[PDB]
Each structure stands twice: as structure tokens, then as C-alpha cells.
């Protein structure tokens, strides 16, 4: 029984709505500061769900520090060039499995 579970907490960026091959998603970026050396990582967060994405796109604002709770996926993709095979690292979020939560104070 495979188990793919991620958790995140950090700064949000470039928030925008659209579709993933005709799927109502609200993709954005979460930046965990995985630390003299301060190493950063900018994760993509694709929140699927016709309603869920809308839900998220409204309460979630840029700058917000939120938690992410979903699967670690990676779309293959075959760009115009070249033979080099590269995968697309994002984070599929979608209830009841996925989960988003903004932090205040």
C-alpha cells in the first residue's frame, strides 16, 4: 500500500486560476525556507476541484503564510526539445485528501 503525503508551510506567491487540461485548478507557489546558509525552495501547488479551487483562490492571498497538505505528483511532459526527459514537480491538492490553511496574527 503506497503512501504519498507531503506537508508544507511558507510564503505564497504568483496566485492565479485557470485549467489543467480542462480542469478548474488554482495553482500557486509555496516557499519553504529549508535552512550561515538559508536554502529556499519554491513549490508549486495545484489545487483541483471545481469548487475547492474557487474556495482557495478567494481566502488565499499573496504573502499569506499557509500550510499545504497533499500528494507529491510530477507530470512527464515532452517539450519541443529535446531528447532530455524532464518531469514537472508540483503538489496535487484536493479534498478530502489535500488541505489548505492560511495563518494569521
Amino acid at each position, epitope marked *: 500500500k503506497s503512501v504519498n503525503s507531503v506537508t508544507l508551510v511558507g510564503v505564497v506567491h504568483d496566485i492565479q486560476s485557470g485549467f489543467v487540461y480542462e480542469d478548474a485548478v488554482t495553482q500557486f507557489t509555496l516557499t519553504t525556507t529549508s535552512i550561515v546558509v538559508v536554502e529556499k525552495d519554491h513549490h508549486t501547488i495545484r489545487c483541483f476541484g471545481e469548487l475547492f479551487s474557487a474556495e482557495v483562490k478567494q481566502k488565499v492571498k499573496e504573502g499569506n503564510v499557509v500550510c499545504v497538505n497533499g500528494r507529491l505528483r510530477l507530470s512527464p511532459q515532452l517539450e519541443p*526539445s529535446c531528447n532530455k526527459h524532464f518531469y514537472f514537480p508540483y503538489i496535487q491538492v484536493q479534498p478530502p485528501h489535500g488541505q489548505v490553511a492560511v495563518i494569521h496574527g
Partner: nanobody
Amino acid sequence: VQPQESGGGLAQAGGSLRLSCVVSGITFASEAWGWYRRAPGKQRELIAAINNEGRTNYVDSVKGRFTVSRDNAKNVMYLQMNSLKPEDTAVYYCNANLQTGTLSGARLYWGQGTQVTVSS
């Protein structure tokens, strides 16, 4: 940007079939498309993908084996399929590859797909 595919059902081992992916109406040549496939059990898997002109990149599999095209004339994608292995059984779809995957859409829509079968 409306899927309208055709061609495919069943052929002897190592055949040669063509595909007609017609974009219903609104501009097509503007984007960069490609074909997918749905194995009887496996999920959605992108295979062929022609550039916007355009030099094409194929999967290790269909590399040299198949070659997809793109004609702005009639707005149709043709997948030159040759030596059709029995392991090439699936429902094939024509659609536009992202940009180059990390990009978000704006509308889009799925098709109905054509069933294809191959058995030695």
C-alpha cells in the same frame, strides 16, 4: 479548440494507420498540440507532441516508429503510425500540450476518443 478525432479500431501486428484530429472552429495553428492514449487499464499518457511549426519530440517508444504532423490548412493532426505493436492498444485523443506543462489553461475541453486494438 474543440476535439474531433477519428480512425482506429483493430489491425494485424505491425500495421499502418492514420489519425484525423480536427479542431472544431476557433483557431488551432496558434497552439502546440499532441496525441495521448488510454490503455484498457492504464491512465492518461501523453505520447506524440508536435511543435508549433514544428520540430517534434516523441516518447522513446514511438520514436522512429511513429511521427505526428500538423497542418494549419484544415486544422488536423495526423499521427503517422507504422509497425503497430500489439502493445499499442488504447483509446487515442488529440489535444494541446501545455507550455510546456507548468502553464495554466484558460478554458479547454476534452474529446471522446477512438478505440484501437492490436493483437498478433
